[PDB]
Homo-oligomer: A and B are copies of this chain.
Amino acid sequence: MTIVQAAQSRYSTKAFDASRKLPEEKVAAVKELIRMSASSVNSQPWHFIVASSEEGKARIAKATQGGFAANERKILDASHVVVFCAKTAIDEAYLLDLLESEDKDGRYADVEAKNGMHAGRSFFVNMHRFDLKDAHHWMEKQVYLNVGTLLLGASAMEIDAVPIEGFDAKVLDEEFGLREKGFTSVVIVPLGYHSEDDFNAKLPKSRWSAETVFTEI
């Protein structure tokens, strides 16, 4: 299957088959894929909650009650659920921890290259913190880029998924103590195999035409 066929055949699963679980190899591949995502200045401004148990899924589904109840069964019936969380703030200590992990990983030949990268990344993060004043939105954008990798990657691995914004992030954040750890939930992605009765598995994919969305130069 080509990556284009993966993009054409994936869809938002509206009903999972609660009997069908992902093999351990597919779960380990999902986790490696999202840890490896690109991010502006290698900020990696993310944390991931992975639920593989009925108790874990029930805890996440506390955030899909009332007006969000249409998403509850997607969480409960999926095999595995990934909660994508973004950093709520960014500071020099996080940037120094990041620079040290890259130094340990062999990215800097000398202290000159290391100091240079810090000064560059610092200039840039501070532009988002203090000049655009949008650092939380900028970090959540990197987390959405990560989600995109998972939606395409899941399809290429023949895994059904649905991205979910329709949840109460205060309830989910409190469920896992995320705000006191500097994180906030932004997207829920349940993973598994769609049920035969998934209405959306039998609808055509709808997108703007290429002549609408492309300007060629």
Q: Which residues of A contact B (CB under 8 A)?
A: 2-4, 7-8, 10, 12, 29, 31-33, 35-38, 40, 42, 44, 46-53, 55-56, 59, 101-102, 105-107, 124, 134, 137, 140-142, 144-149, 151-153, 156-157, 163, 165-166, 176, 203-208, 210, 213-217
Question: Chain B residues with Cβ under 8 A from A213's Cβ?
Answer: 35, 44, 46-48
The docked-state distance in angstroms from the alpha carbon of A52 to that of B55 is 52
Q: What is the count of identical protomers in the complex?
A: 2
Please judge, given known A-B contacts A12-B38, A33-B3, A210-B31, whether A215 and B49 are in contact too, CB under 8 Å. yes
CB-based nearest B residue for A57: B217
Give, as a whole number of angstroms, the nearest-CB distance from A99 to chain B.
10
- The 10 nearest A-B residue pairs measured at CB: A148-B148, A56-B217, A105-B206, A145-B148, A7-B36, A3-B156, A102-B206, A144-B144, A141-B144, A144-B145
Question: Chain B residues with Cβ under 8 A from A216's Cβ?
Answer: 50, 52
Interface CB pairs A-B, < 8 A, 30: A3-B152, A7-B32, A7-B33, A10-B38, A31-B210, A32-B210, A35-B207, A35-B213, A36-B205, A40-B165, A44-B213, A46-B213, A47-B213, A47-B215, A49-B215, A52-B217, A56-B217, A102-B206, A105-B205, A105-B206, A106-B204, A106-B206, A107-B206, A144-B145, A145-B145, A147-B148, A148-B149, A149-B151, A152-B152, A152-B153
